[model samples]
Target: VPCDNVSSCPSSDTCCQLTSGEWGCCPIPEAVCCSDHQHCCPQGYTCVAEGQCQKLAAALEHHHHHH
Candidate 1:
């Protein structure tokens, strides 16, 4: 919290870039580490596309279901 900005946020968190070009740390420790404005998703998830994170295991099983 020293820097109070993503660019300067501690290495313990991922600095998510904001829409207005600002920066902020992940809202939650378990949140997904994103490279965009969303910052991160809720706990226990992974990026599958945009708009949201997918449950890691569910995504894999779902993919197999499609095949």
Candidate 2:
């Protein structure tokens, strides 16, 4: 994903808005937007420990990894 201006991120990542009106890249899709405004977590993860992400067992339903 490419930011509105010149900055760009990998195609598989999400381009998030930073406080400076710039872009931040999260390494996964449908990422959970972080309240800190500079980071994000994957669909099955949550933002914790400041800049870290934690995975939820419930989000990983079944063993198929199909979603």
Candidate 3:
């Protein structure tokens, strides 16, 4: 979903510049990390690493006692 230039996509989409001098869509982390800004990842996707999105982790540890 990255674009080389802002004109490549609609105004609603976010635009970011990469090290290669090309403009691309900002990642989830980059977008969310900054306040007063929007995020890029979809509904279910979770921000795991920089500029990367991944599935949510399951809760493996739980405290319970058996009668």
Candidate 4:
């Protein structure tokens, strides 16, 4: 079953409508994460979920390190 509302879904998660009109949630990899709708990831890291972008944990660590 697809999510009933976007609020119910987590960040970076996507609600895809199937051909049958069924909505489903999927991970929005960091690779495709962007400010625009076509390429927006969760909140952290860039759109490079394909092992190209830094992991969330790593990004957090680096951020803290800088501070």
Candidate 5:
């Protein structure tokens, strides 16, 4: 991402903004930005406690879901 020369993240990275208003890069494409504003997770993964990511299961035992 480009922001008038504020900062430039790599083409393969997802750009995220911090609480302090700085641009940073997430290492994966279409990353899930954490609520903490300082961490990120890859697509298909859910953000867990303390910016951690948990891999999602494809199916649930008693419920139907859609992305």
Candidate 6:
């Protein structure tokens, strides 16, 4: 048993919310809103400052050897 209905949003609104700057909403259900209006950054990105979704820096493994 579930709510079988449709959802709507205002012209000045969206089914979701975001910061400001980009395009449309995210396709991913668990996607987070970016710093753009109702928009989301691509996958593998995260919001840093002011909710701006940017690419996260990857950790590099360090290996030291004695000669």
Give candidate 1 regions above 4 Å deviation: 1-7, 31-67
| Model 3 spans with C-alpha error above 4 angstroms | 1-7, 27-67
Model 1: worst 10 consecutive residues (lDDT sum): 58-67
- Of 2 and 3, the candidate ahead on lDDT is 2
lDDT, model 4:
0.50
- Worst window of 10 by summed lDDT in candidate 4: 52-61
TM-score, ranked from best to worst:
5, 2, 4, 1, 3, 6
lDDT of 1 by residue, 1-67 (tens): 5434446666566566668867777755554554455466544577776566676444445544433
Spell out the clash pairs found in candidate 3: none
TM-score of each candidate structure, all chains considered together: 0.30, 0.34, 0.27, 0.30, 0.35, 0.21
lDDT of 2 by residue, 1-67 (tens): 5577667776666687888877777665654555455445455567777667876546535668566
Residue-level lDDT of model 6, residues 1-67, one tens digit each, is 1212344442444354445532343344344445455456654466677756665354443425337
* Candidate 4 to truth, TM: 0.30
Query: What's the lDDT for residue 7 in model 3?
Result: 35
Indicate the residue-level lDDT of 24 in model 3: 64
Candidate models: Cα lDDT each: 0.58, 0.65, 0.50, 0.50, 0.63, 0.46
Clashing pairs in 2: none
Model 5: per-residue Cα lDDT over 1-67, one tens digit each: 5643677786667677778877777665754544445355555466777756766554565556557
lDDT string, candidate 4, 1-67, tens digits: 2466633446666565667645666565334335455354444545564464333444435554533
The candidate scoring highest on TM-score is: 5
Error of 6 at 25 (Å): 34
Stretches of candidate 5 above 4 Å error? 30-67
User: Highest lDDT among the candidates is held by which one?
Assistant: 2
